[PDB]
Design an enzyme around this catalytic site. Structure first.
Site, mmCIF file in Angstrom:
data_model
loop_
_atom_site.group_PDB
_atom_site.id
_atom_site.type_symbol
_atom_site.label_atom_id
_atom_site.label_comp_id
_atom_site.label_asym_id
_atom_site.label_seq_id
_atom_site.Cartn_x
_atom_site.Cartn_y
_atom_site.Cartn_z
ATOM 1 N N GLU A 212 25.931 39.578 22.220
ATOM 2 C CA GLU A 212 25.530 38.407 22.990
ATOM 3 C C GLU A 212 26.074 37.160 22.302
ATOM 4 O O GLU A 212 25.835 36.964 21.107
ATOM 5 C CB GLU A 212 24.008 38.353 23.119
ATOM 6 C CG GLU A 212 23.491 37.403 24.185
ATOM 7 C CD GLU A 212 23.060 36.067 23.627
ATOM 8 O OE1 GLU A 212 22.568 36.026 22.480
ATOM 9 O OE2 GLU A 212 23.209 35.056 24.344
ATOM 10 N N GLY B 224 22.503 42.637 15.580
ATOM 11 C CA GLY B 224 21.323 42.324 16.358
ATOM 12 C C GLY B 224 20.987 40.842 16.324
ATOM 13 O O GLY B 224 21.372 40.106 15.420
ATOM 14 N N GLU C 171 20.870 49.800 -10.034
ATOM 15 C CA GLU C 171 19.826 50.337 -10.901
ATOM 16 C C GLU C 171 18.542 50.591 -10.117
ATOM 17 O O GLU C 171 17.870 51.607 -10.327
ATOM 18 C CB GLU C 171 19.578 49.384 -12.071
ATOM 19 C CG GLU C 171 18.901 50.018 -13.277
ATOM 20 C CD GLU C 171 17.389 49.964 -13.200
ATOM 21 O OE1 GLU C 171 16.861 49.136 -12.427
ATOM 22 O OE2 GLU C 171 16.727 50.749 -13.912
ATOM 23 N N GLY D 230 21.388 46.191 18.081
ATOM 24 C CA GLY D 230 20.488 46.974 17.257
ATOM 25 C C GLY D 230 21.005 48.338 16.860
ATOM 26 O O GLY D 230 21.908 48.463 16.027
ATOM 27 N N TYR E 11 8.961 33.747 16.074
ATOM 28 C CA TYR E 11 9.995 34.369 15.250
ATOM 29 C C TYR E 11 10.531 33.448 14.159
ATOM 30 O O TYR E 11 11.198 33.933 13.241
ATOM 31 C CB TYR E 11 11.159 34.848 16.122
ATOM 32 C CG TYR E 11 10.871 36.095 16.929
ATOM 33 C CD1 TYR E 11 9.803 36.926 16.607
ATOM 34 C CD2 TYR E 11 11.677 36.450 18.002
ATOM 35 C CE1 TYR E 11 9.541 38.070 17.339
ATOM 36 C CE2 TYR E 11 11.425 37.593 18.739
ATOM 37 C CZ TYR E 11 10.356 38.398 18.404
ATOM 38 O OH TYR E 11 10.101 39.534 19.136
#
EC number: 3.6.5.-
Lengths: 439, 51, 428, 55, 444, 55, 55
Positions: free
Chosen positions: A70, A9, A253, A145, A223
């Site tokens: 892309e 993505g 763990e 995605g 973003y």
């Protein structure tokens, strides 16, 4: 202490290179190749600076996988602040992307690119034998995605035996989103990649929006801010493996400490002692407010009431860096007097974990020098409503059979959407049957 | 002949089970339906694809 | 990396395309000489999306244009940028148009559309890859509807996995050289509803209505008309040709806007209604100049604020302004409407604030969205059909070439299906 | 009973042309697309003749 | 050490052969006085390729200009370099030219071309080292084409296993006002497909078109257009004219240009558009030298880069500049269009650089490159041959001494079998993605 | 074919029930549509027996 | 059953000639319009009536 991460993505590659840039800046892994603290070129592999491999004559590379159909995203990554030391031989991209959907990238056009990245995964899997799961970066509708992940998780759980892994699902935000059919790809991703998983945790962009505009008083929803905050959070998560301290336990763990059930599978990542240039100037850091400000509703990735949010586990992560003395003082100053509403018929043992050797804070960002970390990886059985609201919107939009015609001729059928609704209804009604407190 | 008898014999060898319980095994039952019908159709098309 | 072709058609589609690339090269200024006038040197990809490679940094469109009346294109070739075109667009003859739908649909066009498909086939592969088709197509003439419909059909059997951009001028009772155009409409969108991906109800008598009544312009000419429509669709496609952070791609626009894939007639409006003539010369701020975003009587479609059922919106700004006022304006105009509270449309929050330098303005305010007023546009199309057809009038002009009555009957069956489905949506 | 129906579906298999080395790189993509479209319809017809005849 | 000598065949061939040997000798200077003119002795073997030593350090050709109507040979031969030859040549007889293919090929054998085989037997024997001989074959009429194909058919038996230089001239139907062009030319190239090694099909038709429609020349005579084709052929012959870093023999280049030796039809161009007629004296430097290399204007054919699948391109850069920027621009032209992408012999380019200028413009270039838009030229000639064949058209004097229907039928059948195989090779993309293994392996 | 050409006709004649409904938008508009899909496959094999009677 | 049907194949699908590429554009256009009406009226109404024949 060795693991190789894959990222799919556009936003997945964005958070991936942001977090890897933070890693290379906080270990001293310079763009000169070598780390100047010692005399090993490229990087190192000693105990915890172990994100490398001897590719050349001692040459070490920051081993990761950056994949998107892309093609311009890897070009704009490669001209960034960490320019030329990304791998010149595994940055594999397509020509034309699926362009904001699911079905085309998964079934039709990705079917001749899944085997190429599978061969790349095999070539990097012929390398050093350290293996403690995976670290998969993806979203619901950012780039390809769901289209890559919905196939490659099945391919990993069939081809590579029963090996553990871990994935990153970026939970969307409709106020800054770019699509409308996000209930459909969300419900499809949630019935597919979660039943073939070993560990995961969902990060909400709307939670970042809330803790920025409603808790930090900044006015920039870009973003880049999300990438820097995800870099900080995932760096704090990985810092247990990245730096050795008092309780330097592995991620294996952690994943053999957290997950109780195949269906009861998800945590509520509780880390909001929110900081910037505003909320780091001339303040005082203490082990009371950062720990008392955890259970409140305006600190959470997914929204939940504190009394209605029932903690099956209350695991904690500390960056430490001063002493374990004040942490083992706060185990009585905060952690011992916790009669908070809990889950019935389960142990009520609070867990703490401190990891020394400070990861360096972000250079050139916004936050000033900060010390503590309260990354309290609890879990909440009442996150069934956080997907039941999407199931309700999907019911109110799905009876109209909207956007069905784009998802008919690519292999699936209406029975697949009925099965996805059945799976999320099963998960939710299983939470109100036995997950939420019962008899 | 024997091929179509085999295919319909496997079709009638997938009965719908009884609905009972607190809806745990029903999703596995639906999965068993859809998958096993898929490979019986796969066996059908392979058998009639050689011939 | 991203390439779009240049195929045009018609006798009015060609001139609105001439004005289109004139006004979208107004902010680009790409010279026809070879002096390499760079608009923005970081926008090599975003000049390559439309102006494709022919030489070293000489970027020209995929210039192919066809009609049988060469006077209009010979007139518009002497424009501002009327000579920056490859010597391959000149694929035509002198057979005449005559406002004949049959000769563009069936008889004359079947011997010339082969050259057009051959040249777009041999021009499509001469780039990195193919992404999009586009077309300025009209119904005012006769030939244009038929050959555009057959070209869309041929690109359906030849390039199925490619989008096509189909501008479509709706008939007009207010400006019309000939009146047979109900027949030019009822068997044009008969198959266009299941042949293309996305369409436009840019009207003509609602467009002339807003040119005359609600603007008070003394220019009832094709000139200012083409200026207005070219500016509006330039503001529309600026999002697709300038992807800053948003304004999703070709199939991505078809993914989030098209339920029931026949209902792909979105109506392009525009807020400020700036026009050559009476002009308003203040800096267009967001709230009181984007207040012309929601009014249904201020767009290129006959609509109504209360007798209207929207299910998608889009707004692509061009100025460097904030987004808080945009969000609160959107919240008011989306929570005000009682009939908008339907069981469908959970989220249509797509809005752009991208910093794009305009031509004469400094910002923009664009609307792209579906409704059920396209049903009443097709209803007045249907009442013109009942005015023309119930005594089988004027059908002798067109039945001699290749047509009959049952194509019209299945067209009316499709119209009845459209009316029934949209009335089902209105009372849902 | 459907041993002629499987010969009909083998004729649908027999409606397959070669993938045409003498075929333009845009055009045998179209052959592949009409292939996958027609076996989408064939799969619909196959689950039709599977579900309907079982009753 | 190496010789390629001169002979002529064609009504429009004698003039262009004389002018072409002038323009390859215009910067070398071998005088007919009887003494040497040494200005640069690094072209000793280079001038020995075409001018062979027969006297005391005097280098002369073996030029046999043969015409059945010797008026042109009577007129144009008295040039500066037109008299420095061995004088036992220009064997001629006046039996007639008549613009006829059949009587030129059939009856005029023992009259003149038997003396032509005898004299090329003698003149290829009393020299150092033969590698063939040169001729400007012209299809302007019938007699020249017939004698050219007679010479080709006789030298495939005289020295069979030897690459010998064969040319052709595509006529100009706009200028050649003969009532029947396409018989002799089409049947001649039919013979020459299976009788030769290479054809540099230079033309007078498309060059007439570009000088009348692009160069804006009001006087399109044969003189300046012959200068144009002479500059083009000079740029062609620069491989053997100048001693470079490789000194490439054309014996190697004849095998280099053939992917399969049946098909040997491609013509050059001239990329920087020389100024014979409309004149300019500007120095054609690198970016304007390469900017006009992919043009649909200058190339002497029906120009179509869209209908272009080129196999081997080569441009000699005798302008004094390095080849790094030239190769970068070559890569840009190579990858900017998808029509050139065929991917057979993936290093199908050549950059040969010398330092010897052709003319007073010191830094310039040319265009030679494989031609694939010749299919429409072959069709434009062949279907107007079949236009005047269906009604047995123009058998006025093409009813030859020996006439058959099998010869014409097989001529058009092999013309069909070369144009159809050419269009099968222009299609059927059997290297780019046209196989079955690009989309996995199993697709039924 | 040529006697089995009518055997696919009795196959369509055999297993075509009346479109009994099951829910809205289903079994009278989309099962009818898959039946018309079967009919368009029949149309395609009609234009493909157009070319086998050619040979 | 088979009578009108199979004999209608045996006539109508034997009644399709190739076009004539020789000739000017006018006669070629007339043959093209007769072709594009001929195959449409051969496939459409005939497989409509063989669709709704008796089921």
């Amino acid at each position: 202490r060795e693991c190789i991460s894959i990222h799919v993505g556009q936003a997945g590659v964005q958070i991936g290179n942001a977090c890897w840039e933070l890693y290379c800046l906080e270990h001293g892994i310079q763009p000169d190749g070598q780390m100047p603290s010692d005399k090993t070129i490229g990087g190192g592999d000693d105990s915890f600076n172990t994100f490398f491999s001897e590719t050349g004559a001692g040459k070490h590379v920051p081993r990761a996988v950056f994949v998107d159909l892309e093609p311009t995203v890897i070009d704009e990554v490669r001209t960034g602040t960490y320019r030329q030391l990304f791998h010149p031989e595994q940055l594999i991209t397509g020509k034309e992307d699926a362009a904001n959907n699911y079905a085309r990238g998964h079934y039709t056009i990705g079917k001749e690119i899944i085997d190429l990245v599978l061969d790349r995964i095999r070539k990097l899997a012929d390398q050093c034998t350290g293996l403690q799961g995976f670290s998969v970066f993806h979203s619901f509708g950012g780039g390809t995605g769901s289209g890559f992940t919905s196939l490659l998780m099945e391919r990993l759980s069939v081809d590579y035996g029963k090996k553990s892994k871990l994935e990153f699902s970026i939970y969307p935000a409709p106020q800054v989103s770019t699509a409308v059919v996000e209930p459909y790809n969300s419900i499809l991703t949630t019935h597919t990649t979660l039943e073939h998983s070993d560990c995961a945790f969902m990060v909400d962009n709307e939670a970042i929006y809330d803790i920025c505009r409603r808790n930090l008083d900044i006015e920039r929803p870009t973003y880049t801010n999300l990438n820097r905050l995800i870099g900080q959070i995932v760096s704090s998560i990985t810092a247990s493996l990245r730096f050795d301290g008092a309780l330097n336990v592995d991620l294996t763990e952690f994943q053999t400490n957290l997950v109780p059930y195949p269906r009861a599978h998800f945590p509520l990542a509780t880390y909001a002692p929110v900081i910037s240039a505003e909320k780091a100037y001339h303040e005082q850091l203490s082990v009371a407010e950062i720990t008392n400000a955890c259970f409140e509703p305006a600190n959470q990735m997914v929204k939940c009431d504190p009394r209605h949010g029932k903690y099956m586990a209350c695991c904690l992560l500390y960056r430490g860096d001063v002493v374990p003395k004040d942490v083992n003082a706060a185990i009585a100053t905060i952690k011992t007097k916790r009669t908070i509403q809990f889950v019935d018929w389960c142990p009520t043992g609070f867990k703490v974990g401190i990891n020394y050797e400070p990861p360096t804070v972000v250079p050139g960002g916004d936050l000033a020098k900060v010390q503590r970390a309260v990354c309290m990886l609890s879990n909440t059985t009442a996150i069934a409503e956080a997907w039941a609201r999407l199931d309700h919107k999907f019911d109110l939009m799905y009876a109209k059979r909207a956007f069905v015609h784009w998802y008919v001729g690519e292999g699936m059928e209406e029975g697949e959407f009925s099965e996805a609704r059945e799976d999320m209804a099963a998960l939710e009604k299983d939470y109100e049957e036995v997950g939420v407190d019962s008899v | 002949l024997k091929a179509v008898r085999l295919i319909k014999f496997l079709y009638q060898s997938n009965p719908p089970p009884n609905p009972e319980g607190t809806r745990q095994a029903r999703r596995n039952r639906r999965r068993r339906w859809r998958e096993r019908q898929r490979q019986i159709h796969s066996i059908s098309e392979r058998i009639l694809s050689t011939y | 990396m991203r390439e779009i072709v240049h195929i045009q058609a018609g006798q009015c589609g060609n001139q609105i395309g001439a004005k289109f690339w004139e006004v979208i090269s107004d902010e680009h200024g790409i010279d026809p000489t070879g002096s390499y006038h760079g608009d923005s040197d970081l926008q090599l990809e975003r000049i390559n999306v439309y102006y494709n490679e022919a030489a070293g940094n000489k970027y020209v469109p995929r210039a192919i244009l066809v009609d049988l009346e060469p006077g209009t294109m010979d007139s518009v070739r002497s424009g501002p940028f009327g000579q920056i075109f490859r010597p391959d667009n000149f694929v035509f003859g002198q057979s005449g148009a005559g406002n004949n739908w049959a000769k563009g649909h069936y008889t004359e066009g079947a011997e010339l559309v082969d050259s057009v498909l051959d040249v777009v086939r041999k021009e499509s592969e001469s780039c990195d890859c193919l992404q999009g088709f586009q077309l300025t197509h009209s119904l005012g003439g006769g030939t244009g509807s038929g050959m555009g419909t057959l070209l869309i059909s041929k690109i359906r059997e030849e390039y199925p996995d490619r989008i096509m951009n189909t501008f479509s001028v709706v008939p007009s009772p207010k400006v019309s050289d000939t009146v047979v155009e109900p027949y030019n409409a009822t068997l044009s969108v008969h198959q266009l509803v299941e042949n293309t991906d996305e369409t436009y109800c840019i009207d003509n008598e609602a467009l002339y209505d807003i040119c005359f009544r609600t603007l008070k312009l003394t220019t009832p000419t094709y000139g200012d008309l083409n200026h207005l429509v070219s500016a509006t669709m330039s503001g529309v496609t600026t999002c697709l040709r300038f992807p800053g952070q948003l304004n999703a791609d070709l199939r991505k626009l078809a993914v989030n806007m098209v339920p029931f894939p026949r209902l792909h007639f979105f109506m392009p409006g525009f807020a400020p209604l700036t026009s050559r003539g009476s002009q308003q010369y203040r800096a267009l701020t967001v709230p009181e100049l984007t207040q012309q975003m929601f009014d249904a009587k201020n767009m290129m479609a006959a609509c109504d604020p209360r007798h209207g059922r929207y299910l998608t919106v889009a707004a692509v700004f061009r100025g460097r302004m904030s987004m808080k006022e945009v969000d609160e304006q959107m919240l008011n105009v989306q929570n005000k409407n009682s009939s908008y509270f339907v069981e469908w449309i959970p989220n249509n929050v797509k809005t752009a604030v991208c910093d794009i330098p305009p031509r004469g303005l400094k910002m923009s305010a664009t609307f792209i969205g579906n409704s059920t007023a396209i049903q009443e546009l097709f209803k007045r199309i249907s009442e013109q059909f009942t005015a023309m057809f119930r005594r089988k009038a004027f059908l002798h002009w067109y039945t001699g070439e290749g047509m009959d009555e049952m194509e019209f009957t299945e067209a009316e069956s499709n119209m009845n299906d459209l009316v029934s489905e949209y009335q089902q949506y209105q009372d849902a």
